[PDB]
Amino acid sequence: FKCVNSLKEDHNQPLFGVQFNWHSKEGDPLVFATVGSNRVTLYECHSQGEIRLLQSYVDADADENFYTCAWTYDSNTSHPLLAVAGSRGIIRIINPITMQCIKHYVGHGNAINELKFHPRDPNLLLSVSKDHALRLWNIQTDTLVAIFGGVEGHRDEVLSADYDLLGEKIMSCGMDHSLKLWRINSKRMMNAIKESYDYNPNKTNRPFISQKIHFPDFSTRDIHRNYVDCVRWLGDLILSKSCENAIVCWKPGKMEDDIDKIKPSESNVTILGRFDYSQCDIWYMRFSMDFWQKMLALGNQVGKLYVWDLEVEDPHKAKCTTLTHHKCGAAIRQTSFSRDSSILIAVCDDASIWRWDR
């Protein structure tokens, strides 16, 4: 990777999120979204490092602060869609072509820290909230499928979550120091998703009933000793970090325990490795993976990028490379790889954007 360009957004506030559109069409240039202040902005990557500015959506409320975005597509037309959310607790579904807000969702209206789309179903959107819950939405029928909470759920803000490969289960994490597993391939949840697709408020009198899921299928506070701010599945293993200068690779149970035989009472975890780094001990810093999960990237609080090659026989054998530029000194909140892994974008606390090309 070589640094080929940079720019800075005019708001001078932190850029909290960046996502390439991995649903961009064949023959179209690569496009990424950034979120910060009260806006979302799209850019196109071109030759000679060119980052071409397209168009933003700016919230009507000057005090909105977007924290997260996620791409999907319209399941009938194939056109890409962009979901954004943040401090107002409003999910907006944006048409990236025109930057129109197509529709919006409100749960209880508390800050949303992360959005993720289901890996197999483009209509299923997961939101994680400051109000300690996760919510699963069906953006085809505009239904709240399920709320994951209760006293056995998270006890402080939820900061991140991730679906597994097939979208059969979710791992969430947050300020309570815990990582929690929620299975969504239960008979109850499969039925709830089916029912959400059968719901049309114009053809019935009932409201749509959301599931209240109050018990995770596994919980641990034994991995980290502070806020857990990013989580990703790597097959049946988990990668998670806190503010302790480490990403930990771990699994529920003992070494030979199958993830789908783990019981909610399971008290053990197994640590398969740990990727240490420096100067990333402030709260709220995300890591990202490429589409194939061959690579992992994290920025630190002084503008350095760490990239790990995970194409090795065991997690602890990952190969690290570091990327620095003398003008990039602000905290990197999130990174994104293009689908082919040819471009890595980093976004920063000073509203700067950095492009690295292979």
* Smallest separation (angstroms) from ligand 82D to the CB of 316: 25
Q: Which of 75, 76, 94 is nearest to 19 (CA)?
A: 94
Among 9, 64, 229, 290, interactor with ligand 82D by CB under 6 A: 229
Q: Which of 5, 6, 18, 121 is nearest to 73 (CA)?
A: 121
* Smallest separation (angstroms) from ligand 82D to the CB of 37: 10
Give whichever of 114 and 217 is closer to ligand 82D, judged by the CB atom.
Answer: 114
* Smallest separation (angstroms) from ligand 82D to the CB of 161: 10
Q: Which of 190, 194, 147 is nearest to 172 (CA)?
A: 147
How many residues form the binding site for ligand 82D (CB under 6 A)? 14
CB distance 297 to 288 below 8 Å: yes
Contact letters for ligand 82D, residues 84-113 (x by CB under 6 A):
-----------------------------x
Which residues share a beta bridge with 43? 32, 53
Give whichever of 113 and 138 is closer to ligand 82D, judged by the CB atom.
Answer: 113
Stretch that binds ligand 82D, among 71-79, 148-156, 157-165, 340-348 (CB under 6 A): 157-165
CB distance 261 to 251 below 8 Å: no
- Residue 191 corresponds to which tokens in the numbers above? 């039925």
Cβ neighbours around 96 below 10 Å, total: 20
Give whichever of 21 and 65 is closer to ligand 82D, judged by the CB atom.
Answer: 65
Residues 285-324 that bind ligand 82D (CB under 6 A): 285-286
- At position 78, the amino acid (one-letter code) is S
Residues 239-278 that bind ligand 82D (CB under 6 A): none
Give whichever of 232 and 333 is closer to ligand 82D, judged by the CB atom.
Answer: 333
CB distance 106 to 126 below 8 Å: no
Q: Determine the straight-line distance between the first and last CA of the chain, rounded to whole angstroms.
A: 4
In Å, how far are 10, 199, 207, 208 from 202, measured between CA atoms?
Answer: 44, 9, 11, 12
Among 157, 162, 176, 217, interactor with ligand 82D by CB under 6 A: 157
Among 72, 160, 211, 335, interactor with ligand 82D by CB under 6 A: 160
In Å, how far are 180, 249, 258 from 261, measured between CA atoms?
Answer: 16, 19, 5
Give whichever of 16 and 117 is closer to ligand 82D, judged by the CB atom.
Answer: 16
Contact letters for ligand 82D, residues 13-52 (x by CB under 6 A):
-x-x------------------------------------
